[PDB]
A paper describes a structure:
Far upstream element (FUSE) binding protein 1 (FUBP1 or FBP1) is a multifunctional single-stranded DNA- (ssDNA) and RNA-binding protein, which acts as a master regulator of diverse cellular processes including transcription, mRNA stability and translation as well as RNA splicing. Central to its single-stranded nucleic acid (ssNA) interacting function of human FUBP1 is a tandem of four K homology (KH) motifs, namely KH1, KH2, KH3 and KH4, which is embedded in the middle region in between the self-regulatory and transactivation domains at the N- and C- termini, respectively. Comparison of the four structures showed that they all adopted an evolutionarily conserved eukaryotic KH-domain architecture, consisting of a three-stranded β-sheet packed on one side by three helices.
In contrast to the upper part of the binding pocket, considerable variations of the amino acid compositions within α1 and the β2-β3 connecting loop led to the remarkably distinct properties of the nucleotide binding pocket at the lower half, which is responsible for interacting with ssDNA nucleobases. For instance, a longer loop together with the presence of small hydrophobic (A194 and A197) or polar residues (T385 and T388) in α1 of KH2 and 4, respectively, resulted in relatively open binding surface with strong positively-charged electrostatic potentials. In contrast, the migration patterns of KH2 and KH4 were rather ambiguous with some slight shifts observed for nearly all nucleotides, except fragment 4 and 10 that had a high GC-rich content. In addition, we observed interestingly also that KH2 preferred the T-rich fragment 7 over the TGTG-core fragment 8, which was in contrast to KH4 that showed no preference for both ssDNA. These overall results suggested therefore that all four KH motifs of FUBP1 interacted with c-Myc FUSE ssDNA independently and individually, and KH1 and 3 might exert potential preference for ‘TTTGTGTT’ sequence while KH2 and KH4 might have broader binding specificity.
Residue numbers in the entry: 184 to 222, 231 to 256
The structure:
Amino acid sequence: MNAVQEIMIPASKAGLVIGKGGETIKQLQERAGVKMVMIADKPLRITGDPYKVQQAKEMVLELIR
């Protein structure tokens, strides 16, 4: 069954996660093999295979650092 994990994204970083046209969040979904959607700091909801969600969490946190 899918894991669901939320990363809180500061408002100032939201555009960076999504990117122009959504091209950054599309790349992130392809590279990590999960679904990511946004829900003040905004939750990014990551859904997928439990192993892929853990890696995707690290990839997103590293990007927004």
